[PDB]
Amino acid sequence: VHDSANFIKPTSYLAHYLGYAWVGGNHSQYVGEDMDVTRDGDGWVIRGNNDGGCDGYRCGDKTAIKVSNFAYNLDPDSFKHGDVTQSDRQLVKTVVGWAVNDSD
Amino acid sequence: AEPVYPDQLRLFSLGQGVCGDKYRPVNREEAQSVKSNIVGMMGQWQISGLANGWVIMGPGYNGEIKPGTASNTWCYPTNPVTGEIPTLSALDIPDGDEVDVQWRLVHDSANFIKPTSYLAHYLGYAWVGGNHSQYVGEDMDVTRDGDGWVIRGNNDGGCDGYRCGDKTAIKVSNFAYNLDPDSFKHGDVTQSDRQLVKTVVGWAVNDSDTPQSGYDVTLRYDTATNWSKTNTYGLSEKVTTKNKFKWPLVGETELSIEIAANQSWASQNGGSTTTSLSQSVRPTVPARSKIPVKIELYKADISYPYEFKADVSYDLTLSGFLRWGGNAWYTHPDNRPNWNHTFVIGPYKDKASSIRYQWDKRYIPGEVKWWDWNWTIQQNGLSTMQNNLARVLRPVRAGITGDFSAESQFAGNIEIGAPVPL
Amino acid sequence: TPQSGYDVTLRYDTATNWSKTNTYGLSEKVTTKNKFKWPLVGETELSIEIAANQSWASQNGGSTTTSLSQSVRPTVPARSKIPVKIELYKADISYPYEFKADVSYDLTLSGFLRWGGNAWYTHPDNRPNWNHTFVIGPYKDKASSIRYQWDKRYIPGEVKWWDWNWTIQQNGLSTMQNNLARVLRPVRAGITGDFSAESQFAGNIEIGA
Amino acid sequence: PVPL
């Protein structure tokens, strides 16, 4: 989400092409410039920097781009896991037994 | 583009864009990623120079980043250090019972008491130390409290200072053992207070001319508990009319007519638990022969000794009030509140209890929700914090010998007897 | 070809259950009563009632089930037939047995503790009645284990039943060591006995010719 | 199958 040329710019331009208003910060006039990136909960928010002042109708209502719900398509042979460790072990139940074979 | 650690940032008042050697100016995006940290290290009306003719401003200007120029420049090292917490070699405890190993761990002054006391001090816990010294982590009493241990400054005699009687307490509990897989061994299993549940004896008879494996005897015993709660709410409406008539034969008659309606809503939540134990015997019977079988199920107390070699992890709780002058909690309280925080020394369990996760994520302000480690680095230096945290998170390895014991478990016996010719 | 795909299964289950329920209720009712002269019916008494009720119930229960299953799965030769039989009985069962074993036991002490000095960690001085159980054998719990308490006497926080340091001070380390060694001496014996139980299961599974 |  901090990749300007590969993420911030194309997504900002897509928002602009669809008709979302004020895609960009107050310190430029180009779409997708002067954007702030913040970590919000489990997602990220990219929004034009609303500092100083702006000229325009409702220029303070910057368009927000939210990134969330990341998923990972794994390469099948690449998964590896380390040691499994257990904590706070509370016994549920146990059984001991004998299996006797008197036959031949 | 690249993560920036605030501790490596430095201001140079050497003119517009002229940093020191081995340092380069910080650009706008890097400054924005760590804006709160940089604005925190600036004067209220201070204006500092970024790269590419940009400028960041102080808290008076809400930390605004805008095109401009200035005389001081924010710079970052050309080859920054990663700042990772080092990994030290394992501390070996002499073998013994679990409580003995815990005892040896919590009475180690150089490897446990000092680093943990220093960690409590760097975070801003007040009065980490006893009354008979002024150094942090000295004159500490260790006591065995229930299933845990308490390390607290010795509050004997008298002390000078504000609320000097409220010593910070360090609690050690919730021990866990990551076993070496090939090291576990157990001794004889012994049973006591055996109460018979049920037995079955049987015969498997084979009159055919070939061996037969198709026999099955199965004894199963199940126990369950259940619970439920129900809340009901009702409403009712009723209308009655009463009149008087002279019916021909019966004479004076009183007639009542009543119409009623009712509505009810009920909500129920419940649950259950079930435990089942099954034993089966499936003998292979030789041709023209018969085999006796027996299954028995008992309830019994079970005991056995065991031993293994393990890595040892534990929960470390810090209790006390945070210093008014400065503490590392992210809101930085100033009213000296009481505070308890638990770390998990060992494998990751969650973010709030993991020192390593917070330390690694200190470059993301939105992730900083419990402890401000950048603040500790600024107060004490990066190398000092690294060394203290490396000693706090040092792995511990020990040989353990113990006894398992449990009451009212299951004891089974399955027997296939000797064949009898037909 | 020979066929092994046959199955006859007889299963018998018995169960018991129990339940307990506690219920609490509240009710509120408002009634108004009036008199009118309705045209044709004449003098009429009209009652209007509105009620509300609330109820809370709490249930706890349990069950126990015992199941006995017997299956026969004969392998039948080609162009042939085999008779099968399964029987289930309830019966009393008996048999003799013998083995060689180590012998453990519970040892209870009952009496009043001396006023002059006793080894209980609180050291009562009012001569109270006292019963304490030790398990002579494998470990079961801390309170009944002499060896655990003896080994842990170096930790004051673990000293919660008997003060063995006090006994060492009063009598000497070697004396207490020898006495406890004789108390915890293992015992080995040959045992011959009889098993007997009523209302158990007896089965019979038969594959014929 | 995928080799490990």
Residue numbers in the entry:
A (entry chain G): 106 to 209
B (entry chain F): 1 to 422
C (entry chain E): 210 to 418
D (entry chain B): 419 to 422
What does the original paper state about this entry?
Aerolysin is a β-pore-forming toxin produced by most Aeromonas bacteria, which has attracted large attention in the field of nanopore sensing due to its narrow and charged pore lumen. Pore-forming toxins (PFTs) are important virulence factors of many pathogenic bacteria, which are secreted in a soluble form and upon host membrane binding, they oligomerize into transmembrane pores undergoing a complex structural reorganization. Domains 3 and 4 form the 120 Å long 14-stranded β-barrel, with each protomer contributing two antiparallel β-strands. Four distinct constriction rings, two at each end of the pore, were identified from the structures and confirmed by MD simulation.
We obtained near-atomic resolution (2.2 Å) cryo-EM maps of WT aerolysin solubilized in either amphipols or SMALP, as well as in LMNG-CHS (2.6 Å). Interestingly, we did not observe any major differences between the density maps and models derived from them. The overall Cα root-mean-square deviation (RMSD) between the structures in amphipol and SMALP is 0.82 Å for the overall structures and 0.74 Å for the extended β-barrels region (i.e., residues 215–285). Interestingly, this interaction network can differ between the WT pore in amphipol and in the nanodisc. In amphipol, K242 interacts with S256, while E254 interacts with K244; in the SMALP structure, K242 forms a salt-bridge with E254. These subtle differences in the interaction partners between the two structures suggest that the residues can switch between interaction partners on the same or neighboring protomer, thereby enhancing the stability of the barrel and establishing a robust geometry of the pore lumen. However, β-PFTs are highly stable β-barrel structures, and all methods of sample preparation that we tested seem equally suited for their structural characterization, a property that can likely translate to all symmetric oligomeric β-barrel proteins.
